[PDB]
Symmetry: C3
Subunit: 180 residues, 3 copies
Amino acid sequence: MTDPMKVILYIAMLELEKYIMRAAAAYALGKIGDERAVEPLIKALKDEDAIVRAAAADALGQIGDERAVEPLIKALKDEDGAVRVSAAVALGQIGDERAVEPLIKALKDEDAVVRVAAAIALGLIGDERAVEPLIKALKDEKGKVREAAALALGAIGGERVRAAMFARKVAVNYLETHKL
Amino acid sequence: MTDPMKVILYIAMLELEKYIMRAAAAYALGKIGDERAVEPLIKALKDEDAIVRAAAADALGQIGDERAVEPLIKALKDEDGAVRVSAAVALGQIGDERAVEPLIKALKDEDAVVRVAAAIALGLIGDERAVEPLIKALKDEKGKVREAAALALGAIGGERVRAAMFARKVAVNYLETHKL
Amino acid sequence: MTDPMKVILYIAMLELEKYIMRAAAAYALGKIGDERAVEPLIKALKDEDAIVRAAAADALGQIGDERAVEPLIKALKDEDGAVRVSAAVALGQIGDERAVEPLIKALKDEDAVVRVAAAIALGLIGDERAVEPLIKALKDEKGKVREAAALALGAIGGERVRAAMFARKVAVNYLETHKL
């Protein structure tokens, strides 16, 4: 089975009645990385089942096609926290600067998992506009949100991060990391 | 854990109450490829849960053991479209000529996903009896069915396909492909 | 995405409402192998959904951190057979001798799948205390339990196994195996 065959087959399987088969298809298309799946998966972002929407968003992140930026920014407002997580991470992996301001807003999402996801996505994008919000997130009441904000700050780097550089131990290791 | 251990364990897990665990087991046995799983997975083709039946059929396709041909041809008549998809593809990957006529019939299945799956399976088998039906499928009302029929025709190749060689663009690229 | 990011993200996803997303997270952490996930997955061993508990136990087996021994021995008493399977195998992969006596008891679990799982885990641990029980398991009414006991005996090896070495064909191949 050539990869073109797989893509056509798994794209067609996005219309199967079982939500599990649709999510497995969306995940498969993500692994292959063929851009023929982008618009179909963008449509899958409106699937009735949240599991399908999360899989489609996660797959679009793998493919890394900028066409999915605006739909995934719309997906950031999904009712299901799992979907907002995948949308956030998928936007980080895509790396398009357009996702920064919607992600900064996601950084105050009520769901701490979404906040964690929002923190990491900003680190992947690397836009310096995320430094200040990420430092405020180092004060988050949820420990895992803080850890995510620290890792994201390290991923950005840059002179501005060096300037700004729990929070004490992060910068110390960051500064020692920076010198090394 | 040696692969023999895995096979015995995942074969035993085909009897767990959770349909998800049974499908995950069937999928695992498919990845290992040990033929000890063939008859158990042939039995799994009658599992109550369609997800299990699709996983067992997909796994049998991976193993490529001709013992699964007749049961999978029976699986082609399954009530659940996802199961008929896996049965069709599994028969294509197995490549046994016995599956041609049942697959040609599947090429007119009401479910377009099944038709897509039927088209690709015939391309994998490579039997020239599928040329004429596949050309009629190039006129399918569903675009993805046509694309599948074109790819399948290219996979068969052969002088007869060259003789016969949307439809216009397929043969042109096919003929230019053929010369190159 | 650096592996530290993934770990923090998938650890955070152990709190998503969808049991599927929690199990997928637990499985992901298992593949990465980062020990930051051990205590979170130990907590996941009490998840309401059996699928999550089985995934967390299976992931802990992959990580191989001895901290999971006592919780997984407690997991061996889980109401759901799939969970007891994963707990048993996870203890085998961890290889801690403390799991031998609880596994020997699991070898008489009413669920034959659990017995299969218990047999293999003892083979992975290699503790000679399992020889006698494993030989009695060669008389199990379930064929797959016997096959598992034979493979486990071969994995232990040792002079004591050589001393002791369906059952006839196992030792013959074992003795011929031993000489070769």
